């Protein structure tokens, strides 16, 4: 029997897509989700390292910005389904709450650039210690603060403009989206102040040259910004969805046949069935310890009315179909830069960082670790174990290839050591989880070596468990996507929902959203497709206030009418007070 | 344990370099082997000599991290001083 | 306790041991102003926190701003948070760098938990001078008994009074 | 040899592709007086040895007073003396800190034998790329970048060898 819809890819996008549908048009049509692997959740991944059963080591996604009271701002989509599906949410701390009286937050968090050690406070407290030749003008601003000085320097209020107006803002006689990110900053910053921001701010070696219209209002990552991660780990959402999908009572197909995993789509083809012009030739895929490889068996073919592709860029690029030949879709699949993502977790029986007045957040360095995050201690967790077991996350670099986090992926594997807190509860062959990638006796040793240095230490307590993961492998060939420059994201954000009209194929995913590298981006792309192209309405849990996607400017960015400025009397005033801070 | 010779002093006490050592050793030596009572002035709470660990700690049961919510706060706050 | 309560039943005269200064009456220097003369540079107890520049020991960055006591306390919380908040039995069961803490000689731990300069420092600035003991760290680490707020007492008639009064009484 | 002798048979002209100044000819300053502009501080190739205070890299005491081309050779011998004069066959059996050297990327080595301020240095002052973690057995004796080594260029442009190879075909 054939399928009316085939939501291919089990990402947060897919899992949301199939749910609402079956919920509404599921007794009305044959809906089925198709997964590559043995695991739902996609990039959202949530393992509990042994001994840290209540300290989630989200390999993939971790947090989400709470919704504002006007609901037009904040990760609105995420933060209302987290209530609707009723999922437990704790604060994701970036700073230290202690001291209760005068919370230092991230101010005291560490910096080790150019072989000199300081803290986030030493920016606004004693710039003398920054070992960068920042020109007078620039001397005295924090990485975040600086980006905003620049932004303002461009078109005051750039952060206040809707995407539409933003796109039209030129700088030095060019559209802001025609510049990359660095290409821009290497004309507004001293070549040190350039280098300096490239060594600290937001992610890491990332912040790749990307459309300035996306990457210039990317200052959100500060220590004043509230954030929440699901108690059960971010993978919780796109599993409760995956469950809830198959748990809809009214359905042509029962829950047992609805979620078809270990099915990798290789060819979308135009069939002969004028009602199902989609001959999908899948292939059997087996998952042994995170490593899913193909079972040559037979290419199982299922007939589909429409295929809602919940896939990021490589994932798509991996299907052979005449559909990708469409000249638009040929040249608009390269609208986004693939950028790999690595990550190391290390479990300790003592959060040695606390002894050194660092709690949560990150620390930055010219060392290959580049980054390091202090997560939490098992017993600090609400009704956790009575262990001082804790988690340090890292390897959060982010670069093209052959770096130094792929240079130690070989040797012998790290087996770790049975903590006292897991004696006879788990075995030293079972302490270090078997993942797709197995962190080596070598990569652990160097990481630790490096971590030590970062924190100006002589020797730290050896970790007992450690997992490494990467998103540089197909079916992703990259962690998160960033919009390239000399592209019209505004339009593509709309037209990637339906690249080809005549054809009833819909692509959903953060990979072509406004919320790129955010779960919001994948929910939004799906929801605004369900609504427009599947006529599903605004549900009760979503406000109408939250515009799902941003205003596309006209195609006529040729010499349009000039943007009538607003409360300059305000704008310019906030812009000038913001420069008294750095003086 | 065959003989009736008893050793008291500061040398083999948890109170090394202090008097209290001398006084604590002696008392327990008396309370235990000389059948003396506990001076009405010496409070029941004060444990004289500390208690030992089991003679097999080769695989010790993990200490119950009773209160970290408190301990890790102070350890941290102690650090903020030297900044 | 035994001394504080024995000197009680013996009804012997108690007086404060001032390990520091009582003036000015408003806000005492305690010690703070007390002298040091290490590595041919003079400084005061305050200048450890107030003015670390002035300390002639090239300590590491994480080590600057403490006193020799304070530093010890950091190290101890390093070895294991709330090591002083335990019993002796529990303390014998704490392991650092694989070894039970009580198999380490003091110094032989410091050097692996501190900078040499910080090592020397603490060996050039301690309570009982030449703490040199490489003594079972389990005992000599939580020696947080040396400050300007730590209350001490003496005997008016001197500490020899306690033995004599017993001998008399005996 | 192949390129020098093929240009030989093909009788194509050669010029000395110059890497430094031959002025003065009393004492050519080679490239010593050539420019360097890192970490918003300017200096020369002579400043590396003549005035290592001028180099704005907080490198270790052991590394101070070497030019980067000279520091590569320090690393090599530190690893093993003579590598350069070994045969590939032998250079494959050479091991560092346990692993054979060819199991090391060019930087997964540097960050183990150099300081991070030596690691970052060599980078900035090689083609940033340099090796992007190329096998270390090939990229370690890359110490022919000097103005001390010789280099010849085709007068009619290098493309004249493959063109002249096509025509004679
Ligand atoms: C390192 C990292 C950190 C992040 N941190 C955060 C964060 O803190 N907060 C936040 O909000 N967001 C974060 N994100 C973003 C988050 O991961 C994304 O929002 C989300 O996971 C992407 O959903 P998607 O539907 O676009 O695709 P994905 O979740 O990537 O799903 C793609 C799916 O397609 C499947 N697939 C691939 N090929 C085929 C095929 N041929 N046939 C069938 N199925 C196939 C895959 O198996 C996979 O299940 C992070 C991302 C990364 C990489
Ligand atoms: C410089 C210094 C400073 C100190 N400061 C303090 C302090 O501030 N506070 C504090 O609480 N403690 C302090 N102490 C320690 C304290 O004085 C002792 O712990 C205390 O005297 C212990 O008495 P004891 O009976 O254990 O040993 P002791 O005082 O040594 O008593 C042993 C007695 O036996 C006698 N004796 C030895 N051999 C023989 C023998 N063969 N035959 C007969 N008699 C013998 C000795 O002569 C002596 O009278 C200090 C010690 C020193 C050295």
Author numbering:
A (entry chain A): 12 to 594
B (entry chain D): 512 to 594
C (entry chain D): 87 to 256
D (entry chain B): 87 to 212, 214 to 256
Authors' text:
Comparative analysis of this structure with that determined using X-ray crystallography reveals open and closed forms of the lid-like loop at the entrance to the substrate pocket.
L-arginine oxidase (AROD, EC 1.4.3.25) is an oxidoreductase that catalyses the deamination of L-arginine, with flavin adenine dinucleotide (FAD) as a cofactor. Recently identified AROD from Pseudomonas sp. TPU 7192 (PT-AROD) demonstrates high selectivity for L-arginine. This enzyme is useful for accurate assays of L-arginine in biological samples.
